[PDB]
Amino acid sequence: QVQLEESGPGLVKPSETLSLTCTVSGYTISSGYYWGWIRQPPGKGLEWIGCNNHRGSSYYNPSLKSRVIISVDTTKNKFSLKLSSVTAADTAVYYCARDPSFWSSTSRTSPYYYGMDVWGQGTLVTVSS
Amino acid sequence: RNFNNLTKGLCTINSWHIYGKDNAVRIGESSDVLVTREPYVSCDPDECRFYALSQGTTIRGKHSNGTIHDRSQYRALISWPLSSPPTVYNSRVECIGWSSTSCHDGKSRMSICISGPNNNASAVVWYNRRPVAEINTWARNILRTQESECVCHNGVCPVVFTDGSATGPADTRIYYFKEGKILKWESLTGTAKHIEECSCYGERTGITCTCRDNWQGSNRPVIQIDPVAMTHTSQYICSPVLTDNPRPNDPNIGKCNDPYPGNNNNGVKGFSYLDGANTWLGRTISTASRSGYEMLKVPNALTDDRSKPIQGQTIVLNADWSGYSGSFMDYWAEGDCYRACFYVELIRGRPKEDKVWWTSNSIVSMCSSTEFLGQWNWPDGAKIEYFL
Amino acid sequence: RNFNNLTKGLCTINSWHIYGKDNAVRIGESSDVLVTREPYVSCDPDECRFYALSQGTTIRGKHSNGTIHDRSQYRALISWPLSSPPTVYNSRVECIGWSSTSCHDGKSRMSICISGPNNNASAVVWYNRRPVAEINTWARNILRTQESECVCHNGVCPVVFTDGSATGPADTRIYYFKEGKILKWESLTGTAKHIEECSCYGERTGITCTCRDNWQGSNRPVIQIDPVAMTHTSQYICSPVLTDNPRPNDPNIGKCNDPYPGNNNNGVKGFSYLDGANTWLGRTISTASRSGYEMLKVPNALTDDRSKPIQGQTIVLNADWSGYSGSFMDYWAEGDCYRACFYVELIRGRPKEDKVWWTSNSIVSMCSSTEFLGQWNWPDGAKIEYFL
Amino acid sequence: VLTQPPSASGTPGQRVTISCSGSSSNIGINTVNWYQQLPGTAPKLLIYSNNQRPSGVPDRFSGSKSGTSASLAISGLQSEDEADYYCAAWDDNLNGWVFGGGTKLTVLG
Amino acid sequence: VLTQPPSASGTPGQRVTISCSGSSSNIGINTVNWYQQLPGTAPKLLIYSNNQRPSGVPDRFSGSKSGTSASLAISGLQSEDEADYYCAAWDDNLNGWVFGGGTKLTVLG
Amino acid sequence: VLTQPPSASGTPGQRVTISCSGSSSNIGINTVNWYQQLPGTAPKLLIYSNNQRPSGVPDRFSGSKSGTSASLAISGLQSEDEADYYCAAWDDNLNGWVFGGGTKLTVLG
Ligand SMILES: *[C@@H]1O[C@H](CO)[C@@H](O[C@@H]2O[C@H](CO)[C@@H](O[C@@H]3O[C@H](CO[C@H]4O[C@H](CO[C@H]5O[C@H](CO)[C@@H](O)[C@H](O)[C@@H]5O)[C@@H](O)[C@H](O[C@H]5O[C@H](CO)[C@@H](O)[C@H](O)[C@@H]5O)[C@@H]4O)[C@@H](O)[C@H](O[C@H]4O[C@H](CO)[C@@H](O)[C@H](O)[C@@H]4O[C@H]4O[C@H](CO)[C@@H](O)[C@H](O)[C@@H]4O[C@H]4O[C@H](CO)[C@@H](O)[C@H](O)[C@@H]4O)[C@@H]3O)[C@H](O)[C@H]2NC(C)=O)[C@H](O)[C@H]1NC(C)=O
Ligand SMILES: *[C@@H]1O[C@H](CO)[C@@H](O[C@@H]2O[C@H](CO)[C@@H](O[C@@H]3O[C@H](CO[C@H]4O[C@H](CO[C@H]5O[C@H](CO)[C@@H](O)[C@H](O)[C@@H]5O)[C@@H](O)[C@H](O[C@H]5O[C@H](CO)[C@@H](O)[C@H](O)[C@@H]5O)[C@@H]4O)[C@@H](O)[C@H](O[C@H]4O[C@H](CO)[C@@H](O)[C@H](O)[C@@H]4O[C@H]4O[C@H](CO)[C@@H](O)[C@H](O)[C@@H]4O[C@H]4O[C@H](CO)[C@@H](O)[C@H](O)[C@@H]4O)[C@@H]3O)[C@H](O)[C@H]2NC(C)=O)[C@H](O)[C@H]1NC(C)=O
Ligand SMILES: *[C@@H]1O[C@H](CO)[C@@H](O[C@@H]2O[C@H](CO)[C@@H](O)[C@H](O)[C@H]2NC(C)=O)[C@H](O)[C@H]1NC(C)=O
Ligand SMILES: *[C@@H]1O[C@H](CO)[C@@H](O[C@@H]2O[C@H](CO)[C@@H](O)[C@H](O)[C@H]2NC(C)=O)[C@H](O)[C@H]1NC(C)=O
Ligand SMILES: *[C@@H]1O[C@H](CO)[C@@H](O)[C@H](O)[C@H]1NC(C)=O
Ligand SMILES: *[C@@H]1O[C@H](CO)[C@@H](O)[C@H](O)[C@H]1NC(C)=O
């Protein structure tokens, strides 16, 4: 069973780039599942940020794209999220997750759009002075 | 008739003059004018018309609420006479789809339109008003095309398509069509990294296209197509004049086998005329928004990484909203050269104007001249408050 | 020119793609668009147009109140360019009457229109814009015709007519016309029991028509016409796929020299393409209402009473209102086969939407392809609340 | 954005439902998923493809969709079902995973 | 549906009338009939073809039609004329026998 | 006609500004000038070409223009700066020198 775990700083200053890394273990990510990130402000619901794969076929939330980059390091089985110009509104819990959609799981019997079945425990990032 | 051949050179460009303008929004305020986006200009052997994708609603109707979204089953490609507004009573529908391109080969017109869901999308190629051939997707991620007109040579009309992430690598192909049928296609090659919405023109040889890089940079890709050989290459413009939007500030030295970094996952359609010394580039004034528009004469921009503007002309002030731009030509005009022309979309409404729930555009276009002419401004002139 | 001859075969149908769509209601909300019903598509040698019966009023006018009734002295047959709405300023009137049919024979167009009271009804046959011949009634009970286009071969255009009870046996006739004149007519024969609103297409031989049985069942009648001999036969489709609306649930075994029972005195116009293995049937999704629409590939449906679908495509969701459907073809297109096409009427307003006092329709149409293409939905997209 | 009610409730053993709705670009065309979040952790996928569930999910959780709305029915409500429930779907206009915010389900007693 | 007043009245010997009206698809084009129903039985046809009467019908019953309205005049009103009177016509939109409901005629005394 | 506020004020040493605005035919396209008039004499040109000044004009006077509006900033306000200030521009519809009326700048103390 593939495990996911987030790591990185829990504090970024306003205007700085935030960088979080999710380590994948128990699975080689070069195999093709999509991996991505979800945000949850402390008192709010969930927001999708984006996802990618080993070929770079990324998808991003239009409200964040151009501010956010998601990349995949197959060599080390890691993927990461970067967001420029953080602000107070970006304080949130960030989670990394696995997504078997787009038949990337190597199955054509699956729903094209599936959902996110594997979640890490997440991390809290504060944007502050 | 016969097929148009690319035999003439480009005319010297000393200045630009107005060719046409519809004033669609100003008229639309009190009349049955359609809501459109992504306009372009294309000419038949004896007529020039505006083309655009409509939203299936009029400006003042209640279905104009939410026209900001661009992929729907209510979109279609329409055509109407130059400088007339795209009214509901004078437009002809060419095809249905949310993305399209068209051109005339000297005998008839070809039109390619993309419709469908984001994954199971498809395209239909029309010729002489009949459906001829169809293309399915290959990457299953919003199949896209050129938007602006295509250029044909001796019956062969190369068309650029993209299927794949708009924020990462994507699979692009060039299809070569004749009378609506596919002769062949090629996977894209060369050093360009991401290609979208190519604006193309031909000269005496091949077809040159200026495209958007919507992934890594503000350095526009260029595709060189040989319609006879049906082969092509690519590179970026080697010039420290950035032309995309948003863009970082202009460097002293440009580069061209790699996109110029600083503004990711964004950009707009635009164009250039590359002709050694007779080279002109178009761009917005603002580096952060789709505002203003100018033409710059930048000799040898395609290859000289230290070239800077030596002459230019303002088309749209930065106080005015701009939009997508692109190139076109009348390939049937008398003379020993082609008069280069271009157009600019002027976008009004959301997302910049939040007082209304619609979006729309007006269109202005210009052609080159060998004379040195003066300059003026070309806003759409619509008062947003009149619609409130 | 010369007369069109039925010489080519049908193309293989692997999937359907969009051909056209007017979005008449969405536009009509804020513009001078006419109220219509019973649309169809028909092509001249160089042009395709939509045809429909108008109600003599615009959608937003006050005379739109009560448009639900279909037989009046304010109805007429109009024609307008594909994918444009049926506006008051771009439509041509072909004839006057509450029921009609038309087609082109390669030299000119024939049009037949029915007008008058329920008993003393009559029809006028027009050709090349002149009245040519007239037909009176024989049963004196609302003379009816095909609604969709007719098919001509070497100048002869068979037309199907009905006069008599719509809820019992009726006298039907087939008239054979040439240049608007009657050559002959035949009483209908074969094993079909009740014929209305036949949708016809030709191939290399004869003309095949799919009709409504509005009396006994959900099993559609089929008429086979030989235009040279000017003779015909009939039967029902031998397939456990019911296609009328309303219909009982599909049986395991069908029958065809007798209508399939369970839903009396009702039904809708529809179509099929019968070509052995290359056979497709159209129908609604709902079994109880005019909702949704799908195409099913059902090999040998005409004769195999245990045949079931092997492939299909959704056109309209069951969440969306549907309407009458039918077939058409471009018989002047280049190639060695005919590209099969069809259309669907999308009905809005009364009796399903009681918030408005009018009725109207939008039209969508599609053509076959030999490629396997994806699928999408085609609703009209009108918000009824905008009209309240 | 999808619409969800802010809350739901019932007593143990009752059947309760949570609705989700809005547009034709999302749940109106694509499938809908449901996720359950407990106060201390990451959300778990309960329902996918409108009415399917991942192995390990109790059959007390039953999804359904029609038109432009959807719901999650919870049969046999347990104290353990108190949670934040979320509705999600792919939305072609954005081309990527829209959530409806969540509904707080309270078990009474 | 045709429109009729709910009631009519008069004293014996008076002339009274009952009106009927509405549309161009029915009495406005076709002929109008009148029927008389007594409380214990089936209605009897009194007037057909606007102003004709079946044999056996008293000539005190006189029909008339104009435009989109019609009426039945009863001369010499009798106590025996107390009845429910109905207006009917063929209506081409429905293609079959529309009734106006009825009018109660009361003889006073 | 250009629009100006009727007055402006501040204490010595403060930075104050005077605005000017309206249309696309004038300051919206052409350059804007500023003039200063003292109660007993002809106006003096202070600013021309939006932000340039004639020799002899203190650098405390700084012009600026954007869009369809413009302003004059006075740094280091002096008692001597009390004056009537005027905004002017060429206006192509009239084809000749439009003024905005003036603004009275009062130095407080
Ligand atoms: C009637 O109509 C005519 C026609 O319209 C009017 O005449 C026109 O007036 C306009 C005014 O705008 C001119 O447009 C500008 O032209 C200049 C270039 O011209 C000068 O420089 C040329 C090259 O200089 C180089 O070579 C010389 C060689 O000796 C060398 O000395 C010099 O150091 C340098 O190496 C010269 O060729 C040219 O000379 C010619 O013209 C003279 C005119 O009077 C004439 O006297 C000469 O004899 C000769 O004929 C002349 O010296 C362009 O540079 C300029 O474009 C820049 O400025 C505009 C201003 O808004 C801006 O929008 C552009 O984007 C651009 O500026 C940006 O990019 C620069 C690139 O490095 C950068 O440096 C700038 O800081 C700036 O960058 C900013 O924005 C970018 C945006 O992304 C951002 O990234 C950056 O970080 C930063 O923010 C205009 O094109 C027309 O050319 C002129 N046309 C003609 C035919 O004359 C006429 O005035 C009208 N008459 C009336 C009465 O109204
Ligand atoms: C991109 O686009 C493409 C193109 O659109 C998408 O692909 C399409 O996906 C749609 C999904 O709907 C498919 O449409 C349905 O197709 C099935 C038929 O396909 C299956 O069965 C075929 C025949 O089976 C028989 O032979 C096999 C032989 O071995 C045998 O094993 C089997 O037991 C049986 O004997 C097979 O040929 C076919 O295989 C092929 O396709 C496979 C696809 O993945 C592929 O894997 C295979 O290799 C092969 O290529 C496949 O197995 C139709 O049956 C179905 O129509 C029914 O269901 C719809 C659902 O709403 C319904 O509306 C229809 O009315 C109908 O269902 C009613 O009638 C039935 C008749 O008996 C009845 O049984 C049902 O219960 C139901 O009845 C109800 O309604 C009626 C209404 O009046 C009522 O009377 C009844 O009482 C009751 O209420 C659809 O047509 C497309 O065919 C497919 N197209 C293509 C080209 O693949 C693609 O997915 C898109 N991709 C993305 C990413 O989006
Ligand atoms: C246009 O459509 C938008 C769609 O959201 C309408 O906005 C909604 O309006 C209702 C009624 O006032 C509010 O209850 C909703 O909260 C609004 N939603 C949002 C996101 O603002 C809007 O009213 C429509 N009207 C016009 C004039 O276009
Ligand atoms: C449309 O026509 C109908 C015809 O019946 C009108 O309905 C009548 O309206 C009047 C005035 O309100 C009522 O007294 C009648 O009882 C109505 N008849 C029925 C059967 O409802 C209707 O008002 C017209 N108006 C519109 C908006 O279409
Ligand atoms: C275009 O060039 C080709 C080159 O062989 C020639 O054959 C063709 O006829 C030319 N087109 C016309 C219209 O002459
Ligand atoms: C159609 O077939 C008949 C068969 O005799 C032939 O005479 C006729 O000329 C054909 N039509 C055309 C246009 O050739």
Side-chain angles (χ1 to χ4, degrees), chain F residues 48-85:
Chain F
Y48 69 93
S49 299
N50 304 337
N51 62 8
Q52 300 297 305
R53 65 184 67 80
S55 297
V57 176
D59 57 344
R60 294 188 299 107
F61 294 92
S62 176
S64 179
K65 181 163 78 79
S66 178
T68 57
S69 63
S71 65
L72 173 64
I74 302 171
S75 174
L77 183 67
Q78 301 296 304
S79 295
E80 292 78 10
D81 296 337
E82 180 178 349
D84 289 295
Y85 291 85

Coordinates of all heavy atoms in Angstrom, one line a residue, chain F residues 48-85:
Chain F
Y48 N 4.2 72.5 -19.2 CA 3.8 72.2 -20.6 C 4.1 70.8 -20.9 O 5.0 70.2 -20.2 CB 4.4 73.2 -21.5 CG 5.8 73.1 -21.7 CD1 6.2 72.3 -22.7 CD2 6.6 73.7 -20.9 CE1 7.6 72.2 -22.9 CE2 8.0 73.6 -21.1 CZ 8.4 72.8 -22.1 OH 9.8 72.7 -22.3
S49 N 3.5 70.2 -21.9 CA 3.8 68.9 -22.2 C 3.7 67.9 -21.1 O 4.5 67.1 -20.9 CB 5.2 68.7 -22.7 OG 5.5 69.5 -23.8
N50 N 2.6 68.1 -20.3 CA 2.3 67.3 -19.1 C 3.2 67.5 -17.9 O 2.7 67.8 -16.8 CB 2.3 65.8 -19.5 CG 1.5 65.5 -20.6 OD1 0.5 66.2 -20.9 ND2 1.8 64.4 -21.3
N51 N 4.5 67.3 -18.1 CA 5.4 67.5 -17.0 C 6.7 68.3 -17.2 O 7.6 68.1 -16.4 CB 5.7 66.1 -16.5 CG 6.4 65.3 -17.6 OD1 6.8 65.8 -18.6 ND2 6.6 64.1 -17.3
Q52 N 6.7 69.1 -18.2 CA 7.9 69.9 -18.4 C 7.7 71.3 -17.9 O 6.6 71.7 -17.9 CB 8.3 70.0 -19.9 CG 8.5 68.7 -20.5 CD 9.6 68.0 -19.8 OE1 10.7 68.6 -19.8 NE2 9.5 66.9 -19.2
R53 N 8.8 72.0 -17.6 CA 8.5 73.4 -17.1 C 9.5 74.3 -17.8 O 10.6 73.9 -18.2 CB 8.7 73.4 -15.6 CG 10.1 73.2 -15.1 CD 10.2 73.2 -13.6 NE 9.5 72.1 -13.0 CZ 10.0 70.9 -12.9 NH1 11.2 70.5 -13.4 NH2 9.2 70.0 -12.3
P54 N 9.1 75.5 -18.1 CA 9.9 76.6 -18.7 C 11.0 76.9 -17.8 O 10.8 76.9 -16.6 CB 8.9 77.7 -18.8 CG 7.6 77.1 -18.8 CD 7.7 75.9 -17.9
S55 N 12.1 77.4 -18.3 CA 13.1 77.9 -17.5 C 12.6 79.0 -16.6 O 11.9 79.8 -17.0 CB 14.3 78.4 -18.3 OG 14.8 77.4 -19.1
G56 N 13.1 78.9 -15.4 CA 12.7 79.9 -14.4 C 11.5 79.4 -13.5 O 11.3 80.0 -12.4
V57 N 10.9 78.3 -13.8 CA 9.9 77.8 -13.0 C 10.5 76.9 -12.0 O 11.3 76.1 -12.3 CB 8.8 77.1 -13.9 CG1 7.8 76.4 -13.0 CG2 8.2 78.1 -14.7
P58 N 10.2 77.1 -10.7 CA 10.7 76.3 -9.6 C 10.3 74.8 -9.8 O 9.2 74.5 -10.3 CB 10.0 76.8 -8.4 CG 9.7 78.2 -8.8 CD 9.4 78.2 -10.2
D59 N 11.2 73.9 -9.3 CA 11.0 72.5 -9.5 C 10.0 71.9 -8.4 O 9.7 70.7 -8.4 CB 12.3 71.8 -9.4 CG 13.0 72.1 -8.2 OD1 12.6 73.1 -7.6 OD2 14.0 71.5 -7.9
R60 N 9.4 72.8 -7.7 CA 8.4 72.5 -6.7 C 7.1 72.3 -7.4 O 6.2 71.7 -6.9 CB 8.2 73.6 -5.7 CG 9.4 73.9 -4.8 CD 9.1 74.8 -3.8 NE 8.8 76.1 -4.3 CZ 7.5 76.6 -4.2 NH1 6.5 75.9 -3.7 NH2 7.3 77.9 -4.7
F61 N 7.1 72.7 -8.7 CA 5.9 72.5 -9.5 C 6.1 71.3 -10.4 O 7.0 71.4 -11.3 CB 5.6 73.8 -10.3 CG 5.3 74.9 -9.5 CD1 6.2 75.8 -9.1 CD2 4.0 75.1 -9.1 CE1 5.9 76.8 -8.2 CE2 3.6 76.2 -8.3 CZ 4.6 77.0 -7.9
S62 N 5.3 70.3 -10.2 CA 5.4 69.1 -10.9 C 4.1 68.6 -11.5 O 3.2 68.4 -10.8 CB 6.0 68.0 -10.0 OG 6.0 66.8 -10.7
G63 N 4.1 68.5 -12.9 CA 2.9 68.0 -13.5 C 2.9 66.6 -13.8 O 3.9 65.9 -13.9
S64 N 1.7 66.0 -13.9 CA 1.5 64.6 -14.2 C 0.2 64.3 -14.9 O -0.8 65.0 -14.6 CB 1.5 63.8 -12.9 OG 1.3 62.4 -13.2
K65 N 0.1 63.4 -15.8 CA -1.1 63.0 -16.5 C -1.3 61.5 -16.7 O -0.3 60.8 -17.0 CB -1.1 63.7 -17.9 CG -2.4 63.4 -18.6 CD -2.7 64.4 -19.7 CE -1.9 64.1 -20.9 NZ -2.4 63.1 -21.8
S66 N -2.5 61.1 -16.6 CA -2.9 59.7 -16.9 C -4.3 59.6 -17.3 O -5.2 60.3 -16.8 CB -2.7 58.9 -15.6 OG -3.1 57.6 -15.9
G67 N -4.6 58.7 -18.3 CA -6.0 58.6 -18.7 C -6.6 59.9 -19.2 O -6.1 60.5 -20.2
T68 N -7.6 60.3 -18.6 CA -8.4 61.5 -18.9 C -8.4 62.5 -17.8 O -9.3 63.3 -17.7 CB -9.9 61.1 -19.3 OG1 -10.4 60.4 -18.2 CG2 -9.9 60.2 -20.5
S69 N -7.4 62.4 -17.0 CA -7.2 63.3 -15.9 C -5.7 63.7 -15.7 O -4.8 63.0 -16.1 CB -7.8 62.8 -14.6 OG -7.1 61.6 -14.2
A70 N -5.5 64.8 -15.0 CA -4.2 65.3 -14.8 C -4.2 66.1 -13.5 O -5.2 66.5 -13.0 CB -3.8 66.2 -16.0
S71 N -2.9 66.3 -13.1 CA -2.8 67.1 -11.9 C -1.5 67.9 -11.8 O -0.5 67.5 -12.5 CB -2.9 66.2 -10.7 OG -1.9 65.3 -10.6
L72 N -1.5 68.9 -11.0 CA -0.4 69.7 -10.7 C -0.1 69.5 -9.2 O -0.9 69.9 -8.3 CB -0.6 71.1 -11.0 CG 0.5 72.1 -10.5 CD1 1.8 71.9 -11.2 CD2 0.0 73.6 -10.8
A73 N 1.1 69.1 -8.9 CA 1.6 69.0 -7.5 C 2.5 70.1 -7.2 O 3.4 70.4 -7.9 CB 2.2 67.6 -7.3
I74 N 2.2 70.7 -6.0 CA 3.1 71.7 -5.5 C 3.7 71.3 -4.2 O 3.0 71.2 -3.2 CB 2.3 73.0 -5.3 CG1 1.6 73.4 -6.6 CG2 3.2 74.1 -4.7 CD1 0.6 74.5 -6.5
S75 N 5.0 71.1 -4.3 CA 5.7 70.6 -3.1 C 6.2 71.8 -2.3 O 6.5 72.9 -2.9 CB 6.9 69.8 -3.5 OG 7.7 69.5 -2.4
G76 N 6.3 71.7 -1.0 CA 6.9 72.8 -0.3 C 6.1 74.1 -0.4 O 6.6 75.2 -0.6
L77 N 4.7 73.9 -0.3 CA 3.9 75.1 -0.5 C 4.4 76.3 0.3 O 4.7 76.3 1.5 CB 2.5 74.7 0.1 CG 1.4 75.8 -0.1 CD1 1.0 75.9 -1.5 CD2 0.1 75.3 0.7
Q78 N 4.4 77.4 -0.5 CA 4.8 78.7 0.0 C 3.7 79.7 0.0 O 2.7 79.5 -0.7 CB 5.9 79.3 -0.9 CG 7.1 78.5 -1.0 CD 7.8 78.4 0.2 OE1 8.2 79.4 0.8 NE2 8.0 77.2 0.7
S79 N 3.8 80.7 0.8 CA 2.8 81.7 0.9 C 2.6 82.4 -0.5 O 1.5 82.8 -0.9 CB 3.1 82.8 1.9 OG 3.2 82.3 3.2
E80 N 3.7 82.5 -1.2 CA 3.8 83.1 -2.5 C 3.0 82.2 -3.6 O 2.9 82.7 -4.7 CB 5.2 83.3 -2.9 CG 5.9 84.3 -2.0 CD 6.3 83.8 -0.7 OE1 6.2 82.7 -0.4 OE2 6.6 84.7 0.1
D81 N 2.6 81.0 -3.2 CA 2.0 80.2 -4.2 C 0.5 80.4 -4.2 O -0.3 79.8 -5.0 CB 2.2 78.7 -3.9 CG 3.6 78.3 -4.0 OD1 4.5 78.8 -4.6 OD2 3.9 77.2 -3.3
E82 N 0.0 81.3 -3.3 CA -1.5 81.5 -3.4 C -1.7 82.0 -4.7 O -1.1 83.0 -5.2 CB -1.9 82.6 -2.3 CG -3.4 82.9 -2.3 CD -3.7 83.9 -1.2 OE1 -2.9 84.2 -0.4 OE2 -4.8 84.4 -1.3
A83 N -2.7 81.4 -5.4 CA -2.9 81.8 -6.8 C -4.1 81.1 -7.4 O -4.6 80.1 -6.9 CB -1.7 81.6 -7.7
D84 N -4.5 81.6 -8.6 CA -5.5 80.9 -9.4 C -4.8 80.0 -10.4 O -4.1 80.4 -11.2 CB -6.3 82.0 -10.2 CG -7.3 82.8 -9.3 OD1 -8.2 82.3 -8.8 OD2 -7.0 84.0 -9.2
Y85 N -5.1 78.7 -10.3 CA -4.4 77.8 -11.2 C -5.3 77.3 -12.3 O -6.4 76.9 -12.0 CB -3.7 76.7 -10.4 CG -2.6 77.1 -9.6 CD1 -2.9 77.6 -8.3 CD2 -1.3 77.0 -10.0 CE1 -1.8 78.0 -7.6 CE2 -0.3 77.4 -9.2 CZ -0.6 77.9 -8.0 OH 0.5 78.3 -7.2

